[PDB]
Amino acid sequence: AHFPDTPAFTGFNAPSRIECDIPNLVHEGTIPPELNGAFFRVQPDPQFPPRLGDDISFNGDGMITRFHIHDGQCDIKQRWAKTNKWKLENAAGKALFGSYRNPLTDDESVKGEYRSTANTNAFVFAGKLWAMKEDSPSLTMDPATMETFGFEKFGGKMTGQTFTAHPKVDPLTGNMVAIGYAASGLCTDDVCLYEISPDGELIYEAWFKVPYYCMMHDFGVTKDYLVLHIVPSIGSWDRLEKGLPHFGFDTTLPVYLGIIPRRADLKQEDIRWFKRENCFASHVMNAFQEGTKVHVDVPEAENNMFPFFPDVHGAPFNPQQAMSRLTRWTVDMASNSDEFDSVTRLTETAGEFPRIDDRMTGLPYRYGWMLEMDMKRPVELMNCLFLKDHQTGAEQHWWCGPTSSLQEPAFIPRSKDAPEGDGWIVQVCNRLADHKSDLLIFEALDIEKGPVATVHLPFALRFGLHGNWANAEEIGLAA
Amino acid sequence: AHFPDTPAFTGFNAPSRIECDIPNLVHEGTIPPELNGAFFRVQPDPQFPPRLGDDISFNGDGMITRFHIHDGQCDIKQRWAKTNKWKLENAAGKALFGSYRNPLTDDESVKGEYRSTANTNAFVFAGKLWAMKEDSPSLTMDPATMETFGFEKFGGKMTGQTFTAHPKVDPLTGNMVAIGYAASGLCTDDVCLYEISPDGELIYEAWFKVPYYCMMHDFGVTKDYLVLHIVPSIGSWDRLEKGLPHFGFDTTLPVYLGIIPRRADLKQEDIRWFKRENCFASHVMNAFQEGTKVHVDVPEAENNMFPFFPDVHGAPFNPQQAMSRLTRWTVDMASNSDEFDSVTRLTETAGEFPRIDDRMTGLPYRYGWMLEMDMKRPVELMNCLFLKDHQTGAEQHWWCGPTSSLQEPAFIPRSKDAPEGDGWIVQVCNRLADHKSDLLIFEALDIEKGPVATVHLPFALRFGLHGNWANAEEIGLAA
Ligand SMILES: [Fe+3]
Ligand SMILES: [Fe+3]
């Protein structure tokens, strides 16, 4: 394959496309013999050169990595998420879909096809692996063999056209809670709220409208509510006609937080929109209720964090204003006005990719992990694992050294009823000087001493998005 | 896996064990659209940590790489050669066989098992892939799927216990010509000569004895003769009992060249042994007859080339005396004495891994390729591809640059009846600074301009041994 000689396709961003199997990877330290399950993660990775001759990172085809940890060893299986795009392009021997979220650039042969790359999450639910991209229904896959099933529309009961890549699991029921924005077509202001039962059946789909179409990438869930931030990374057909990146950031628009009842009978008038000044947030650590209030913890930045989705008024990217710090947004459902009850920065540590012990989804919670950017460290940039204790305020940091960077952590519980945060953190480390990757395993509440085990891969993973652990019994692997 | 922190298992020698599939690898330049077939090569690569806690390179399990070149692209498939050793150790979850060519160090559970790692050649013949190790019958594999069949003993017609990893194909018949040394058991002086017809049936097996047991790694074949050099890298049960490496070099023993009739009716008295002073040679570029003479071209060194098989009298390794240069050994079957007719250095270029256009096997020939060690080049060591023209004397060199090294080249003919050397050279390049490998494709008689195509692998291969091209119709791949 002849790929462009551009930054998105070179160096750390060289196309990989490795499908492989390796058991018993070379490792150092002690892999807890308690562990029996697998960590799934996804990397965008282009099957073919892009039609335009360049592209962005968020547009590579989804390649799924599984790290099966058992018997004190770690194995790898890596396979493509075989979306309709993947299959059509594979059969044609070339790219047929064009630029990111831009159907105007697709070959005529694939008009009316799902454009999903399934490249944003590798999530386990209802005995399936969900390879997820927020512009289409989720793909599903067999978590044991990693074969692909297809797109999931729940027996026709899902009528929305899209499904999130940030599903939540409510611990009170085991339901998956999801959204789909642009639900009636590209750039529409319609959103669906979905709840799926543990058996994988759609329970309900509820439609509503938002203040403006924008990237609704993530959200929070509480017992009673969907908690939906409205942040003006906006897109439009006009942008696409003009050849611009689908999204761009508008610093002149307000930010909202919508509190939407988790109810099949939802009506637009049931929703409360709280309003604040322009800022940027993408991911949700967790949300929870307290009295008549809703709290959501997000990495908040002063301005846009996506250089590839630029300022709509032509301003150059501002890295300093893109620094994000975990911040609690609180709204009171009993309040008179639409003002937030409070906005409170929770740490001065800059970071992103927030995670919790997912058994605390929607509940008051003590611990949060993030990828941290510590710009004071020497470097030759997400260079630390960070843990925040909301009860005491305490912070832990672990630095991966001067020639490495880190990918999103994932929490592994010791047992179903173990206390919050009792378990391990796993995360990919990019060993950039060695052009390879490690899988690191930490004691989840004692990270400063470093990983208790380091699993070496004999090749490099690419930049990853989201990932998750599941125990073996949830994914068809050996007890 | 916990591997030793020793040079044989670290850095470039880190265990890989990658089984993978990647079509349409990222590449630069122009892959000739004429090419339609595959290059197979083998790397020793340990499935498990060694029993002793250290080992040597020549003892890793054989991992087979196939580069399928077609339609102007290159694909990779990499799979283990599943020897009985591989299978037994895989089932046990640990190493059971011990040190190199040393049955005394094996677990009792595998007494009486073939110790083959099938790690020395990946050769195509009779519709099969032969994964070869000279201490046992060859393994065979499906060249299309790369599944393993098992060990080949030709319907019981092979009674020798071993088979070479340097088979030759006689162009006059299409027969495979092979030897097996230590044919009646470890360290014995018995050798078999075998010829196999193009259909894969054993034609004959002929037994003879050699002046002394030694590493009989390679040999030449002419129309009438097996041409067998006797070089004193010697082994013995006593060495093994004393815990020494199986082989060690004895500078006090003479070197012989045996001329053995290619005849099922061979008797010991039919053989002529020519004798010369101590020196070292391992590989054969080619052998051929002229009148009553036999010529064989070998990389000759003054002393041992294997530091891991040390001088039997305790001398430290001498790298200067290990420099090998292509040299013609000529013997006259009509001569009165046992002296060589002549020994003539053919180049001052130092190198090894000699190859020809294999359609010239056993015949007078014009071209030879080698891996060259040019110690005058900057380096931050096999660093050049070398081509010798025996007709004009001309030499070509291509240097892979200051941070790379090269593996064995293989010649690809343009067509069955194309002239000698009309075609391409393929070879793996170790891009050590990038911890990855390239496959290089050269115009076989115009190498100084560099490769016409460079195929990037998204991972590193390990040190390789021998490899071969076959056209698609010889290996079950698409026309
Ligand atoms: Fe995300
Ligand atoms: Fe050899």
mmCIF file of N, CA and C and ligand atoms in Angstrom, chain B residues 120 134 165-166 217-218 282-283 352-353 408 465-466, ligand 2:
data_model
loop_
_atom_site.group_PDB
_atom_site.id
_atom_site.type_symbol
_atom_site.label_atom_id
_atom_site.label_comp_id
_atom_site.label_asym_id
_atom_site.label_seq_id
_atom_site.Cartn_x
_atom_site.Cartn_y
_atom_site.Cartn_z
ATOM 1 N N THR B 120 15.957 -23.938 10.442
ATOM 2 C CA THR B 120 17.123 -23.597 9.629
ATOM 3 C C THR B 120 16.790 -23.275 8.176
ATOM 4 N N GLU B 134 18.759 -30.144 10.763
ATOM 5 C CA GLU B 134 19.608 -31.239 10.309
ATOM 6 C C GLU B 134 19.781 -32.365 11.310
ATOM 7 N N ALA B 165 19.238 -29.503 6.249
ATOM 8 C CA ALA B 165 18.519 -28.253 6.035
ATOM 9 C C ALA B 165 19.037 -27.492 4.825
ATOM 10 N N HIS B 166 19.907 -28.112 4.006
ATOM 11 C CA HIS B 166 20.416 -27.485 2.793
ATOM 12 C C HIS B 166 20.153 -28.338 1.559
ATOM 13 N N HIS B 217 26.843 -29.431 7.621
ATOM 14 C CA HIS B 217 25.710 -28.519 7.499
ATOM 15 C C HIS B 217 25.280 -28.334 6.055
ATOM 16 N N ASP B 218 26.235 -28.267 5.131
ATOM 17 C CA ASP B 218 25.952 -27.961 3.731
ATOM 18 C C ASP B 218 26.841 -28.860 2.876
ATOM 19 N N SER B 282 31.553 -23.358 5.758
ATOM 20 C CA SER B 282 30.231 -23.872 6.091
ATOM 21 C C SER B 282 29.367 -24.005 4.846
ATOM 22 N N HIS B 283 29.078 -22.916 4.162
ATOM 23 C CA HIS B 283 28.095 -22.916 3.091
ATOM 24 C C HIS B 283 28.722 -23.094 1.718
ATOM 25 N N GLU B 352 29.105 -14.082 3.536
ATOM 26 C CA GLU B 352 28.544 -15.390 3.818
ATOM 27 C C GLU B 352 27.147 -15.436 3.211
ATOM 28 N N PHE B 353 26.382 -16.460 3.569
ATOM 29 C CA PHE B 353 25.054 -16.693 3.013
ATOM 30 C C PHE B 353 25.060 -16.617 1.467
ATOM 31 N N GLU B 408 19.607 -13.179 4.612
ATOM 32 C CA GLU B 408 20.015 -13.904 3.415
ATOM 33 C C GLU B 408 19.193 -13.486 2.199
ATOM 34 N N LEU B 465 17.609 -17.620 9.255
ATOM 35 C CA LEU B 465 18.493 -18.562 8.589
ATOM 36 C C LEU B 465 18.122 -18.567 7.114
ATOM 37 N N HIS B 466 17.711 -19.686 6.543
ATOM 38 C CA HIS B 466 17.595 -19.779 5.089
ATOM 39 C C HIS B 466 16.155 -19.646 4.608
HETATM 40 FE FE FE C 2 23.099 -22.764 6.638
#
